[PDB]
Structures are given as C-alpha cells and as structure tokens.
C-alpha cells in the first residue's frame, strides 16, 4: 500500500476528503484548529497514489502527504 500522513498544520477545510477518488480520507474531531477537525486516512489500502489530496491542500507546504510504496492491485488501479 501507500502511506498517507497528516501533520498538525491542518486547518480542517475538508478539501482533501472531497478530492479523494477512492475514499481513503475522512474528517475526525479535534481541538487543534478553528474548524476543530483533522483529516485522517484509515483506508490507505485503497490509495491509488494520485495525489489529488495534496493538490487540494491549502496550507503552505501541505498538511497531507502521500508516500508511495509497495504496489498492489488496488494501488495500481487495475480493473483486471
């Protein structure tokens, strides 16, 4: 799988969760920002690695990173 990390510079604008085409991301409660929410990545086995989440992230030098790793059938996006 790939690895999707979240750092504490998150501001909880939910844009990475909306950008994700495979439901890797979700918003969890928090007290570290004004929006009172972080991103979290529980379904990283479904990460294709397309980095739409990083494109959607607005904080300067991203609060979400994808570290590409071992390739599986799901991460290669293969329908066969």
């Amino acid at each position: 799988s790939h690895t999707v990390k979240i750092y504490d510079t998150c501001i909880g604008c939910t844009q990475c969760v909306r950008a994700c085409p495979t439901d890797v991301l979700e918003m969890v409660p928090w007290d570290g920002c004004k929006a009172a929410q972080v991103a979290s990545s529980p379904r990283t086995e479904d990460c294709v690695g397309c980095k739409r989440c990083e494109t959607a992230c607005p904080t300067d030098f991203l609060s979400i990173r994808v570290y590409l790793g071992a390739e599986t059938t799901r991460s290669m996006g293969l329908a066969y």
Partner: protein, 135 residues
C-alpha cells in the same frame, strides 16, 4: 444485494476476470424517477425509479458514479466490496455518514503531531525499519 440493474445494452468496458477471481464491487442507490446517466465504463444507461444495483470493477468507479449522483441529488448511494467467497462487506460510507462531515467515534489514523519540516533525516533513521514519516 437488492436492486435492479440499470437498463443498457452492455459494453466491453464492464467486469473482467478480476471479478470472479479476487474482487468485485457494487453500488446501490434509490432514484425518485427513471433518468439517463453515464456509466463509468463508458455509455449511457437508465436508472430505475426505486432501488438500483450496478456492479463495477473498482471502488473508484462507484465513487465517480456516486459523484455524478450528487448532480441528480441522489445521496443515499452505498458501495459494497464483494469477494469470490460470497463475502460482502459494506465500505462506503463506512461510518454511515459521508466522510466530508465530522462524525464522533472516528479516531485519528496516521496523524503526526509535528509539522512536516520536523521529520528526521534519512541518515538518522538508516539501517532500521522506520521511515522518516513514521512518527
């Protein structure tokens, strides 16, 4: 699963041998009326008035399809993972609430309590199992 398969004449874009061997997916939704949508595999299909059930090769197909079911204001779409053992698991939404909304009972996964310029150097973590992003 319950639902009527949407009306179209078939395509070469549909399910291949991966469905019978390792993984198959399915999306169900209920529609107020019969209307034409676009299949993820290419082509026009008609959804039924009432519940539907369309099988798909990948999870991303159902998320693209449920993304264009937002444009018809259909927001009760569910996605199921189907293994060749007959084992059907319900994946999206997994909590019951769409992941854009915060629901309680959700725990942080893969959170790092630091900013990203505060990762260790790769030489500091060399010849061990850990990566620089791991905690």
């Amino acid at each position: 699963l319950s639902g009527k398969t949407p009306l179209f004449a078939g395509s070469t874009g549909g399910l291949l041998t991966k469905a019978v061997e390792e993984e198959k997916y399915a999306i169900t939704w209920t529609s107020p009326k019969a209307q034409v949508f676009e299949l993820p595999t290419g082509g026009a299909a008609t959804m039924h008035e009432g519940e539907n059930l369309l099988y798909i090769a990948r999870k991303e197909y159902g998320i693209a399809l449920g993304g264009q079911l937002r444009k018809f204001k259909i927001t009760n779409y569910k996605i199921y993972r189907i293994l060749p053992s007959g084992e059907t698991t319900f994946i999206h939404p997994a909590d019951g609430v769409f992941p854009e909304k915060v629901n309680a009972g959700r725990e942080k996964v893969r959170f790092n309590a630091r900013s990203i310029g505060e990762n260790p150097n790769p030489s500091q973590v060399k010849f061990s199992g850990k990566a620089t992003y791991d905690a």
